Amino acid sequence: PEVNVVMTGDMTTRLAFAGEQLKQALVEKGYEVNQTTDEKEIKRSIYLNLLNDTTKKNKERFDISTKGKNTYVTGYDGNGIIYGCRELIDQLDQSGTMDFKPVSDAPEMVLRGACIGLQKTTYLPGHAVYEYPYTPESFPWFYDKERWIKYLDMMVENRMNSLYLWNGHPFASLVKLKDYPFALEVDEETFKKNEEMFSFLTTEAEKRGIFVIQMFYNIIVSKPFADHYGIKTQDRNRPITPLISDYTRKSVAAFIEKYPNVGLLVCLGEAIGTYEEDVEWFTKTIIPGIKDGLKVLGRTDEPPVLVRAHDTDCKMVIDAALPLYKNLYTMHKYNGSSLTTYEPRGPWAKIHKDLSSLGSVHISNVHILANLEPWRWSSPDFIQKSVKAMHSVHGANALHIYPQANYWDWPYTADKLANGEREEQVYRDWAWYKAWGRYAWKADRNRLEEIKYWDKQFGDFYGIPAEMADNIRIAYEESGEIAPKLLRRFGITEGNRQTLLLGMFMSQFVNPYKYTIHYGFYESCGPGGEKLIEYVEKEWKKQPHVGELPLDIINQVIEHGDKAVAAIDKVVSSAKKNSDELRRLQNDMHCYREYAYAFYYKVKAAQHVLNYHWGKNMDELDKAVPLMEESLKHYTKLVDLTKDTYLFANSMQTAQRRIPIGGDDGNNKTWSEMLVHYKAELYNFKENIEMLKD
Numbered sequence: 001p002e003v004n005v006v007m008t009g010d011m012t013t014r015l016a017f018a019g020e021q022l023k024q025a026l027v028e029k030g031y032e033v034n035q036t037t038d039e040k041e042i043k044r045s046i047y048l049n050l051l052n053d054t055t056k057k058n059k060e061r062f063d064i065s066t067k068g069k070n071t072y073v074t075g076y077d078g079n080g081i082i083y084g085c086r087e088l089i090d091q092l093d094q095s096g097t098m099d100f101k102p103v104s105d106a107p108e109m110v111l112r113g114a115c116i117g118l119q120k121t122t123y124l125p126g127h128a129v130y131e132y133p134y135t136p137e138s139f140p141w142f143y144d145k146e147r148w149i150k151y152l153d154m155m156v157e158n159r160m161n162s163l164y165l166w167n168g169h170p171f172a173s174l175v176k177l178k179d180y181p182f183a184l185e186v187d188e189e190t191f192k193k194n195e196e197m198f199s200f201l202t203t204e205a206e207k208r209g210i211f212v213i214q215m216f217y218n219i220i221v222s223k224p225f226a227d228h229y230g231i232k233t234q235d236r237n238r239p240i241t242p243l244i245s246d247y248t249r250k251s252v253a254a255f256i257e258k259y260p261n262v263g264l265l266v267c268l269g270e271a272i273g274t275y276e277e278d279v280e281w282f283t284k285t286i287i288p289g290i291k292d293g294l295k296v297l298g299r300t301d302e303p304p305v306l307v308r309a310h311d312t313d314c315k316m317v318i319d320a321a322l323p324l325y326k327n328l329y330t331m332h333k334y335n336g337s338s339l340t341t342y343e344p345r346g347p348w349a350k351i352h353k354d355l356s357s358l359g360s361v362h363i364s365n366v367h368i369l370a371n372l373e374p375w376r377w378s379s380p381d382f383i384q385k386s387v388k389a390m391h392s393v394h395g396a397n398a399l400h401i402y403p404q405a406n407y408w409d410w411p412y413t414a415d416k417l418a419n420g421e422r423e424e425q426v427y428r429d430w431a432w433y434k435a436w437g438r439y440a441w442k443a444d445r446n447r448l449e450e451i452k453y454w455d456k457q458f459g460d461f462y463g464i465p466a467e468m469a470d471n472i473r474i475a476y477e478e479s480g481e482i483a484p485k486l487l488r489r490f491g492i493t494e495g496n497r498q499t500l501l502l503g504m505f506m507s508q509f510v511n512p513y514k515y516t517i518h519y520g521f522y523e524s525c526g527p528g529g530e531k532l533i534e535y536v537e538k539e540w541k542k543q544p545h546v547g548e549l550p551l552d553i554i555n556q557v558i559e560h561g562d563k564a565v566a567a568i569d570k571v572v573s574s575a576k577k578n579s580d581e582l583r584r585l586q587n588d589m590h591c592y593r594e595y596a597y598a599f600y601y602k603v604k605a606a607q608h609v610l611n612y613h614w615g616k617n618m619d620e621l622d623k624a625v626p627l628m629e630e631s632l633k634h635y636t637k638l639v640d641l642t643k644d645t646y647l648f649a650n651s652m653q654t655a656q657r658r659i660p661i662g663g664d665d666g667n668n669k670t671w672s673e674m675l676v677h678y679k680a681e682l683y684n685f686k687e688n689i690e691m692l693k694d
């Protein structure tokens, strides 16, 4: 049939994009589309009306009404019209028809976005941590315009309005300083490509209602700057110097001037020695450079500057900066560098609440996902309860998500495909982005309706009836509890210093404090409860148990694993689309189940070892041995499941990875390597037992 798309109001880039998305989606569903503004032609019509203003009240709001063959979309701003068209397109995909239900809606969280890291699995030669110039050699994908469009369209589809680029020192790839011409860290040809890609990225983001934000760490200078002056690129023990202050102030002023719509996300770390130096750097170097740039542009607005809480005293920094610059946003990790709970609490919740209490935008950062690497994860139930806690426990009104896994190896997942081919994170992790977007838009959605929604999404992706597709949801929601529960109850850290899914040594259960556990982790990252060492000590001292108990958690986790496997195994014979991906999701569920069993058996071994330390009964060490053997049988099966299907587990392939073992020079990033260590663990344990009897 013939359909009119009628764009009224002053034509803006976002109204044009909205109308073109609607046109393209109508044509895909087989309609003929007339784009017209003529009363004489305007037969079946959709009117896109963009309103002028309406202030914070109506930010990103749309109204859809229908009277028979006519549909009216009112967008309160450019994002609103884009989201109104999204609502129609979502309805057109779910039905197959232009029978539209009226909707009036607007997002709960005011910034909803994801990050890409201009980062790699290992350091570049001559460079320290986080230091990567923007070059085609390091980041060929950064220069791929077709890849950017696919990424930005995924962000619009999930109603995300913010994209963050993470880099240690981006300025020396992006701006030239006449006072420090030698500082530039890329050749002229690459400098011109970087300018073009920034102009492309900001233009394509802008028409999609996406705020581009450049993240930078401090204090870091370019390699050629450092070599010119005979100094280090970065040194936490190096105090603020006038020279480095001037370079950085001018770098920041140049960036503001050259890329006037790009936000800044400031980390006052990890190369600043003290909180007083954090404040001094932010208030006397960065803010003056931002003000310098705005003054060059003749701008009297204060666009938002975003400040991380990470490695600083965020409240102390904001309290000092607010007199100089009013428009400050905060950001703080949701569960440190992992995803552990939808019941956060404790001292880290109090940092959230104190930043939330400034009455600005406080951004929850779902950061790094150390405990999820590298297997598929995207539990609608877990993500919904987490966003609810972001509101109810943290007072966050905004969301920043990392990639679900494999942050340091963008744009690919850790999957090993048959071809030598790499799997795209955008393709694999579609439900991660979709779920975070969905709940950031609206957290309180009826759970029975959400089950129907997700059953249909999974069913459509795999060409399975919604009813059969319920097994895909169950696999995600059962498997999704495993890495969060095990890390919070037995982890050394929520940091990427640990790679949970490579497993743990029995010693890390028996003597966890040897491996350095920081205050705040156990106190913040889930329900109150007992470590295995605490549980066993209380058993011997006949003290009552309180909270989340470790033997309860390993029991729940093996049930999660078995239920995930049972669910996903029911659908593989049925999938008519994306079958090869379904086979990889099936394999990931078998990985989680073998992982859970290996973990279960090793914790039970550790309990016997702790019983020996308290009571000195040798029978306890004899009981531990067959449990460590069953642990190794499950871990051996996990190696067989990962051998042909994963490149590695941790994407941060450096000596900063300590748990379960050192990751120096990219070693011990595979289950195969860890099986060598765990065999030796068993042989060494049996030797210790023989020595103690003799």
Ligand SMILES: O=C(O)[C@H]1O[C@@H](O)[C@H](O)[C@@H](O)[C@H]1O
Binding pocket: 311, 336, 337, 493, 494, 495, 496, 497, 518
């Ligand atoms: O490795 C670790 O344990 C630590 O890493 C630090 O960067 C972080 O600020 C801590 O919360 C902790 O996760």
Ligand SMILES: O=C(O)[C@H]1O[C@H](O)[C@H](O)[C@@H](O)[C@H]1O
Binding pocket: 267, 310, 337, 367, 368, 495, 496, 497, 652, 656
């Ligand atoms: O928050 C941050 O920037 C950092 O936090 C931890 O130190 C983590 O090990 C780093 O890899 C980085 O993610």
Ligand SMILES: [Cl-]
Binding pocket: 308, 309, 310, 331, 332, 333, 365, 367
């Ligand atoms: Cl943060």
Ligand code: NA
Binding pocket: 268, 269, 270, 272, 273, 274, 275, 278, 310, 311, 312
């Ligand atoms: Na700091």
